[PDB]
Design a protein around this ligand. Sequence first.
Ligand SMILES: [Ca+2]
Ligand SMILES: [Ca+2]
Ligand SMILES: [Ca+2]
Ligand SMILES: [Ca+2]
Ligand code: NI
Lengths: 29, 141
Amino acid sequence: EVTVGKFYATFLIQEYFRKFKKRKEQGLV
Amino acid sequence: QLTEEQIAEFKEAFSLFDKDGDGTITTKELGTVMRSLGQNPTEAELQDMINEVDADGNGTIDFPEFLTMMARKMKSEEEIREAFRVFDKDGNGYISAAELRHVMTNLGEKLTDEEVDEMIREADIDGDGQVNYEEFVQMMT
Ligand SMILES: [Ca+2]
Ligand SMILES: [Ca+2]
Ligand SMILES: [Ca+2]
Ligand SMILES: [Ca+2]
Ligand code: NI
């Protein structure tokens, strides 16, 4: 389903932020 | 495999939809999140989204139902493309600082302007100060 794709897209949007925050903490930006 | 950290990350996505923290996602809660991201589903759109994921048919999504759907999906251009378009809300093909702040605030993130610029610089391969689709996928991939 592309129906479930809207849920996953939001996870991806949150993933975009979480990846960054981790990099900034561990000094890997 | 499906790791404890990956489950944890999916629980975080679940918590974004489950605004009241009661353990289930309703059509009203789903509509809230989608509207906050500048989307505009109909009652019927939202109900079929619930219907798709609600496996026990009680009318709402609990975390095991959400996890089932999310772990299956994890196994993708169209989802990443929708994610990009959420940020790029003027459809000009570039995510600006203002667009990032827009999504961040609606996600409950709280980053400084300096962190928003750091985010952009890390992704900004062509040096134009904004994130195009290519650069967005690269950062995600
Ligand atoms: Ca709820
Ligand atoms: Ca259910
Ligand atoms: Ca834009
Ligand atoms: Ca760029
Ligand atoms: Ni808005």
